[PDB]
Amino acid sequence: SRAEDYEVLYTIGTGRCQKIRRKSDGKILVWKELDYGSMTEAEKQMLVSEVNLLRELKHPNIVRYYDRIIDRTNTTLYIVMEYCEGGDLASVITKGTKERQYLDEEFVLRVMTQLTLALKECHRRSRDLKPANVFLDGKQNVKLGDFFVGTPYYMSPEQMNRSYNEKSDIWSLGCLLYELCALMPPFTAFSQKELAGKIREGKFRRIPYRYSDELNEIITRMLNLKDYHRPSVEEILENPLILEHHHHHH
Numbered sequence: 001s002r003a004e005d006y007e008v009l010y011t012i013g014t015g016r017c018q019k020i021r022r023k024s025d026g027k028i029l030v031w032k033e034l035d036y037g038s039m040t041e042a043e044k045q046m047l048v049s050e051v052n053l054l055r056e057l058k059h060p061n062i063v064r065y066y067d068r069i070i071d072r073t074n075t076t077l078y079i080v081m082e083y084c085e086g087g088d089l090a091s092v093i094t095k096g097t098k099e100r101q102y103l104d105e106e107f108v109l110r111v112m113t114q115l116t117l118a119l120k121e122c123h124r125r126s127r128d129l130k131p132a133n134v135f136l137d138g139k140q141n142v143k144l145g146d147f148f149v150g151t152p153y154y155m156s157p158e159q160m161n162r163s164y165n166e167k168s169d170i171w172s173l174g175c176l177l178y179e180l181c182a183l184m185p186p187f188t189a190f191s192q193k194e195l196a197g198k199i200r201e202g203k204f205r206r207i208p209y210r211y212s213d214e215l216n217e218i219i220t221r222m223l224n225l226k227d228y229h230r231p232s233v234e235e236i237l238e239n240p241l242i243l244e245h246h247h248h249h250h
């Protein structure tokens with residue numbers, strides 16, 4: 001409830017994200033620093049609405065947001081959440097590139113399974129689905145988090161023309177799983193106009209051959225140009241590839 005109840009250990013990323021320890025029990029967590037000092041009251045009311053919505057999101061595959069803290073003399077809002085020791089998927093992918101080493105299919109199956117269930121929960125309740133918004137804990141669990149300039153690698157053909165569309169999320173997941181496998185996005189280009197052209201032709205290289213035809217097929221379906229040809233979250237979870245151990249475990 002009060003920032004004094006926690007001790008900052010060190011900064012993770014820079015508002016700042018920080019690893020913290022709760023004094024009462026020694027519990028490891030993180031908080032996100034939001035400086036609302038230059039925000040209007042209308043923007044603060046907005047921010048309050050968003051923070052109450054985060055508190056309501058309880059799901060093994062979604063970053064758990066525990067608390068909120070206001071420091072009035074620092075005009076700083078702190079969002080306290082679980083600590084995900086594994087970092088984000090972006091870093092995993094960049095690690096793969098450097099190591100010249102592809103990720104295990106088992107790992108890709110875990111991400112596919114757990115992110116789909118995350119998405120399934122988000123739809124039931126009715127955000128940005130990219131590697132830098134997907135996090136890993138210390139137990140092989142995958143969690144969706146974070147609810148110009150640069151190219152929109154994952155922008156679906158519908159979003160290009162015109163979402164809101166749940167099949168648009170499936171395309172984004174396809175892009176993400178594809179980049180996990182090939183260590184590069186399915187569609188690359190130097191300009192957003194070139195990119196859009198590539199996206200509309202709907203063509204891409206098969207994921208590397210170390211990955212099964214079955215994994216390649218489901219990712220390919222998610223990247224269908226027609227939103228109605230992409231599998232739903234339910235049809236995804238029905239896939240013979242997806243087994244119990246791919247799901248979360250406490």
Ligand SMILES: COc1cc(-c2cnc(N)c(N3CCC(C(=O)O)CC3)n2)cc(OC)c1OC
Nearest residue numbers: 017030063082083084085087088091145146147
């Ligand atoms: C240990 O290495 C890293 C950890 C994290 C990290 C760990 N736990 C988190 N809860 C977390 N947050 C930060 C942003 C959140 C938000 O936007 O709501 C959700 C997840 N991050 C992050 C790292 O770099 C990105 C990292 O190093 C690779």
Ligand SMILES: [Cl-]
Nearest residue numbers: 060141248250
């Ligand atoms: Cl969990």
Ligand SMILES: [Cl-]
Nearest residue numbers: 097100101102
């Ligand atoms: Cl490689």
Ligand SMILES: [Cl-]
Nearest residue numbers: 201202203204
């Ligand atoms: Cl085609």
Ligand SMILES: [Cl-]
Nearest residue numbers: 205206207208
């Ligand atoms: Cl290839």
